[PDB]
Ligand SMILES: Nc1ncnc2c1ncn2[C@@H]1O[C@H](COP(=O)(O)O)[C@@H](O)[C@H]1O
């Protein structure tokens with residue numbers, strides 16, 4: 473099946489076509505019907521599988537544009553690293569031209585991202601420490617999150633972000649959709665899934 | 679997504695509609711794009727999930743009708759029990775009106791099934807002991823199998839059918855598609871997957 477065979481809106485199919493993206497990878501093909509229907513998913517997959525679009529497409533599809541100044545994000549993606557935050561943000565921006573994506577990460581000052589968040593965002597792609605700092609400063613508001621994604625949960629564990637990840641998830645409404653990607657499923661990630669996800673289907677392409 | 683949103687041929691959508699089947703269950707929704715594209719899948723799922731159609735639909739879709747007298751089956755489904763063989767056969771018959779499905783099982787004499795097989799079949803749904811007896815008698819010919827399904831691999835293990843299952847799979851061409859369903863994945867089933875499947879995606883709805 474091609475991307476056009478899935479329930480994806482025009483601006484997304486046009487964006488995909490513009491980058492020569494036509495045919496879902498296996499994790500995308502298996503995930504999309506579920507994820508596009510709002511269901512929670514665990515994607516056991518590493519980079520190279522197309523896992524990013526497996527969550528970025530759902531986000532793109534579910535979120536309609538908004539121009540509301542100062543608006544709070546409706547999608548949150550957590551990543552272990554600045555590098556992956558930037559990469560994921562770029563990809564989401566590319567498949568969701570209708571959305572404002574803000575990347576949040578450390579190894580830099582707080583001002584620029586704070587001001588981006590305060591201007592308004594539809595999606596935030598963040599490393600957990602910096603995200604939690606903004607949450608607790610009242611700069612990042614997660615009360616409107618509809619889709620939360622943990623991208624490389626095992627790495628976030630290895631880097632000691634468990635408490636941050638949990639605090640961030642706890643700040644989002646449980647009505648959300650949650651997608652969890654991880655190559656491995658250590659017991660913390662399994663617990664995270666049990667606590668923060670709704671009967672997720674697991675798709676493993678390892 | 680509804681069944682009509684997947685690449686299923688008219689006789690199958692008509693059959694589904696005739697039974698009021700419209701919307702894939704989660705394992706179906708995740709499996710179909712992969713399975714309809716010929717890919718191998720492990721479905722970690724128990725009865726109640728819709729796992730049967732997750733493999734019966736692919737079989738139905740891939741196999742065009744044939745009227746060839748004495749033809750050898752192009753699909754093989756192995757089940758642990760007579761009861762499940764009969765149930766799966768019934769379901770496959772119902773979604774594949776264009777195919778002749780033969781159930782093979784023990785606890786009965788050999789004549790009736792032998793004669794059914796010799797008349798020709800498109801799909802055989804069998805328990806492993808009886809299937810292997812027919813194979814070795816030269817009555818069941820598996821050289822044309824295009825789709826093999828292990829349905830409840832863990833149960834087939836628990837009932838001591840490992841050697842039979844392996845012999846049967848070994849008799850099918852490796853060019854086939856293989857689908858393996860099992861609630862649990864004991865090491866024999868994992869080995870079976872490694873040996874007899876091609877990079878399968880695992881979908882777990884447990
Ligand atoms: N469906 C697709 N078709 C072609 N390339 C893809 C597709 N999905 C993702 N990619 C590329 O696959 C690579 C790995 O993606 P990921 O596994 O998300 O890190 C990236 O270079 C993506 O641009």
Ligand SMILES: Nc1ncnc2c1ncn2[C@@H]1O[C@H](COP(=O)(O)O)[C@@H](O)[C@H]1O
Nearest residue numbers: 701702703724725726727728729730731
């Ligand atoms: N997509 C579906 N919609 C409604 N009922 C279904 C669907 N797929 C399977 N069923 C029913 O689900 C039950 C369990 O199927 P299984 O898990 O394959 O044993 C059976 O009663 C099937 O008829």
